[PDB]
Amino acid sequence: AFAVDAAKAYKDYLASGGQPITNCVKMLCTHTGTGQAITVTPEANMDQESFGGASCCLYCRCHIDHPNPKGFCDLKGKYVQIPTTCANDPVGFTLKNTVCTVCGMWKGYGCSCDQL
Amino acid sequence: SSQAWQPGVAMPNLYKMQRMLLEKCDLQNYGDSATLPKGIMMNVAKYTQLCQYLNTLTLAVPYNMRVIHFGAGSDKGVAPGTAVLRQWLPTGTLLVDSDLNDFVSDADSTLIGDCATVHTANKWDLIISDMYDPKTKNVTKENDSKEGFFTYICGFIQQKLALGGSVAIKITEHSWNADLYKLMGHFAWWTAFVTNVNASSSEAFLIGCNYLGKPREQIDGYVMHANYIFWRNTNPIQLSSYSLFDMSKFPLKLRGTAVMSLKEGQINDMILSLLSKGRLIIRENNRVVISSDVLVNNENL
Numbered sequence: 120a121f122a123v124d125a126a127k128a129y130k131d132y133l134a135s136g137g138q139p140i141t142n143c144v145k146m147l148c149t150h151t152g153t154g155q156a157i158t159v160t161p162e163a164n165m166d167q168e169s170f171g172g173a174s175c176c177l178y179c180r181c182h183i184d185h186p187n188p189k190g191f192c193d194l195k196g197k198y199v200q201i202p203t204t205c206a207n208d209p210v211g212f213t214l215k216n217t218v219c220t221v222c223g224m225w226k227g228y229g230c231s232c233d234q235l
Numbered sequence: 236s237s238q239a240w241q242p243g244v245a246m247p248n249l250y251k252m253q254r255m256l257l258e259k260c261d262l263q264n265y266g267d268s269a270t271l272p273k274g275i276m277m278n279v280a281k282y283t284q285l286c287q288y289l290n291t292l293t294l295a296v297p298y299n300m301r302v303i304h305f306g307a308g309s310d311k312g313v314a315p316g317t318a319v320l321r322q323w324l325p326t327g328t329l330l331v332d333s334d335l336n337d338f339v340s341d342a343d344s345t346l347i348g349d350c351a352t353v354h355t356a357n358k359w360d361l362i363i364s365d366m367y368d369p370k371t372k373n374v375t376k377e378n379d380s381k382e383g384f385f386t387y388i389c390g391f392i393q394q395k396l397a398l399g400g401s402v403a404i405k406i407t408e409h410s411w412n413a414d415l416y417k418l419m420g421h422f423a424w425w426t427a428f429v430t431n432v433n434a435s436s437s438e439a440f441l442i443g444c445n446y447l448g449k450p451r452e453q454i455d456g457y458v459m460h461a462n463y464i465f466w467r468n469t470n471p472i473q474l475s476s477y478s479l480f481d482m483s484k485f486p487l488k489l490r491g492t493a494v495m496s497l498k499e500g501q502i503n504d505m506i507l508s509l510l511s512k513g514r515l516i517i518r519e520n521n522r523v524v525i526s527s528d529v530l531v532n533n534e535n536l
């Protein structure tokens with residue numbers, strides 16, 4: 120009945136004023152990409168930075184099990200696009216936000232499915 | 236200059252042809268630093284420039300490409316170089332990486348342990364190594380050929396590099412091995428490539444381009460390293476990050492290079508000519524299976 124809730128601990132640490140997880144791996148790219156959230160190669164547009172996925176995954180970085188029942192990782196082996204305004208904390212960003220299953224953009228940072 | 240807009244500088248052929256004696260490496264630009272783009276790590280920049288240079292060679296790029304990356308962990312527990320290689324390589328390329336120390340990676344599989352514990356059933360199309368022990372940079376003692384992981388790498392190349400495949404192995408003034416240089420003469424072409432971002436360092440990547448499985452050329456590795464240091468000592472390289480800003484042509488072209496299985500008898504001069512041009516890979520196209528040897532001990536009583 121007991122599970123560590125690392126997502127919550129990080130959210131609360133951030134709210135308490137803790138320094139975000141660092142050493143996320145930022146990639147060089149054109150910044151003319153599709154802007155989709157999680158891609159097989161860097162796809163940052165002009166408003167985004169692209170990062171190596173594993174380095175932005177709370178579970179990968181904390182050496183803990185992934186909440187997937189199969190332990191699978193959405194980020195490892197891919198690239199994650201982070202709004203430049205949130206690039207000081209990619210792990211917090213990926214943890215708090217959600218990818219539109221339709222258009223592949225971050226809900227709230229690219230997804231225009233709910234009326235353009 | 237010209238050179239500052241390149242990703243780096245390759246050792247000019249004429250320096251390869253010398254018979255220098257080994258001297259101490261004294262770099263004019265030691266202590267200079269390139270101005271990296273905001274938030275970009277040295278490792279990312281360095282691998283980006285290495286890959287930009289590799290784009291200018293005749294690398295074989297088959298379907299179901301197999302790449303292995305040694306020395307891939309950082310002190311911060313991530314794998315920046317692996318991330319650049321996976322960006323560079325065609326999507327779907329099988330990428331395995333390894334380090335003595337634990338790290339989290341975007342590679343398809345990661346083995347933690349001494350490289351000497353690493354075994355693979357299959358052959359590889361490209362081998363990258365950034366393995367380095369900073370305890371070799373002892374300037375007060377003689378600079379002899381080093382063994383350690385270099386001995387592993389030389390065997391790994393001869394046993395597990397596909398014909399037509401390529402390598403890039405990081406060396407420095409003190410981190411080098413004579414047999415590895417000798418093995419460069421078993422490729423159609425070779426060089427020592429210095430990245431412009433890290434040009435203040437005696438680091439280079441020794442690149443073997445298109446493996447032939449036999450000597451094309453007899454290289455004395457003690458002399459060749461002295462040649463490399465002579466070049467470095469007399470050719471200051473301007474630190475530059477210029478090439479990092481143009482990634483438009485970065486991805487490695489998926490050439491669909493042909494792969495054939497062949498027995499050492501059927502490798503004739505026509506096969507060798509195709510190998511030499513980056514037009515052919517020779518190896519099995521079986522499943523990729525790797526492992527790490529684990530030493531078992533019970534410390535109780």
Ligand SMILES: Nc1ncnc2c1ccn2[C@@H]1O[C@H](CO)[C@@H](O)[C@H]1O
Nearest residue numbers: 306308334335336349350366367384
């Ligand atoms: N014999 C070995 N087997 C595997 N990795 C090795 C060594 C020696 C050094 N390293 C790794 O190389 C990286 C660069 O210093 C460092 O990350 C360091 O751990």
Ligand SMILES: [Cl-]
Nearest residue numbers: 257377378379
């Ligand atoms: Cl010496």
Ligand SMILES: [Cl-]
Nearest residue numbers: 454455458459
């Ligand atoms: Cl020689």
Ligand SMILES: [Zn+2]
Nearest residue numbers: 176178179192
């Ligand atoms: Zn993860």
Ligand SMILES: [Zn+2]
Nearest residue numbers: 219222230232
């Ligand atoms: Zn959407």
